[PDB]
Symmetry: C3
Subunit: 229 residues, 3 copies
């Protein structure tokens, strides 16, 4: 209770936890080998996020970086959460549109750089260099969104009509959800510094619960998975 933002981490931790339990219950009873894959990916994301927000809650996922003339606290576990949950989400979009292996490796590789670089910028002690990694990270995001908004839209339209319009929904969601992250980072205390830490923790918590529980609720509640029967 020593931090003026533990409520957001506490709320997030609970939201990830209960979100994992629902996917556990709702995921029990699935026999379709193609559907069980989507339920394995989607349930593990909040499982990861729950362990990550509990570490930030207890203070383990927190460290100090001397930049900007202050000892700004950096929730590194936040980026670690993203490092693990983003590639799983990309795997949901891939398996839905039945993307070839090549395309999948590119998106995953670009995603790791986006999170890898992003974390460097967040730990960079030189204030000016922080945004250099931000520019790199953000560019890596635009590539991922490019193949998602343009590469998979055609393949999905050529896929089943159950998964065609279903991908269009998650596409628009992904375009706007991912875009919010570099924005919140930039205005946050880690980037420009216009928004204080506690509000930064809140906006990022909202994005996380949306992109780790909400997003999952759209997929699993859609018959675009399973088999044609």
């Amino acid at each position: 209770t020593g931090r003026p933002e533990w409520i957001w981490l506490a709320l997030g931790t609970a939201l990830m936890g209960l979100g994992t339990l629902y996917f556990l219950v709702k995921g029990m009873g699935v026999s379709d080998p193609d559907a069980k894959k989507f339920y394995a990916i989607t349930t593990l994301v909040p499982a990861i996020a729950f362990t990550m927000y509990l570490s930030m809650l207890l203070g383990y996922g927190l460290t100090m970086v001397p930049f900007g003339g202050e000892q700004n606290p950096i929730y590194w576990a936040r980026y670690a959460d993203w490092l693990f949950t983003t590639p799983l989400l990309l795997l949901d979009l891939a398996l839905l549109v039945d993307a070839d292996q090549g395309t999948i490796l590119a998106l995953v590789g670009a995603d790791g750089i986006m999170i890898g670089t992003g974390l460097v910028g967040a730990l960079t002690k030189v204030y000016s260099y922080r945004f250099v990694w931000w520019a790199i990270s953000t560019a890596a995001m635009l590539y991922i969104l490019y193949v998602l908004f343009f590469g998979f839209t055609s393949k999905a339209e050529s896929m089943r009509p159950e998964v065609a319009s279903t991908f269009k929904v998650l596409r628009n969601v992904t375009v706007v959800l991912w875009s919010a992250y570099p924005v919140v980072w930039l205005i946050g205390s880690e980037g420009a510094g216009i928004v204080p830490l506690n509000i930064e923790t809140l906006l990022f918590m909202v994005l996380d619960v949306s992109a780790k529980v909400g997003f999952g609720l759209i997929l699993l509640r859609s018959r675009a998975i399973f088999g044609e029967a």
Copy 2:
């Protein structure tokens, strides 16, 4: 020779090393594409364990964590060893019962959390929080054992009779081997503190050599691999 438990790490290092050489020799001459997979998984485990026990032996895989009112030394490499060797073992059980892709990702993901959380608890400076991560880690173990003792038992019985009864043996082994770890951790100096460090290093070495050399001796010496010929 400055530590009263280097003998256990030294003995372990040798046992992992010689265990890797046997699997190297015995694994030479395998042409079956399905059998070579099992020999690649099973041989790399002690290869990893050997490098990990040598680091603890030389002192590289060791660090101090201020918890419980003492500077308790924590062999982090121990958990890193588990982080790398457990998913390979799970891959042996998977390929033997021919488990679908979905099931494999769940077990691997749960396994990473079990080891990930477990390591946090081992590095936690707040003594009370150490067991919170223990509870999480142990729960993650029960899930893995649940799908192994119940999920794969039916699929194995429906698989070949060579691999059916063969999985039943490794199943009983896995149930009891994995269970011993959270127990040794809890009574060890990292958890409750009833057992001193050096005896903790011993019990964990026994488990490691069993679960990284012994376990491998049961699989490779079983015709449940190879092809039906």
Copy 3:
């Protein structure tokens, strides 16, 4: 500009960057599902290397290790670069010769140990132990080269004649490129100390640009990829 070797890291960073852009442009327009895989692997390598050399350039990928009686600076990001780019290259050789899954896991697992151990030796504070990990790492290299120079040569000769002679070229390249690394490490300031740091940074930069841009230029400019048409 505070380091007498930033020119080599700066030059490397630019060479990785522009190398990534060419593979981006040249990789645009590929529709063959088998060819897109090779273009995804080969383009991500310098993408990784570019982010890694920029971190060493800005100083982020640098740390001090007290060994040999001095505070020798260790570019850990250098090894991290190798940790990520080597398995991708091995995947190029694998997919070209259509190596079975088993063989691929062995090479990747051995590769991780080679880089994993190598990094330990580079961070080892005891000077004598540094070469113990070197011996282990180098041995792990000889295994990788053994399966490449002997294991895949027969399979490639039995593969397409487009990919048969093409693998023979990359084979001879790989044998000599990989061999140079443990040599440069040994004579460098991290090993024996015969060569100063700045020249060490240069020889390793040359190897990196060759093995991350040059090597990629040989594969993508070869019709051994694509489909038989």
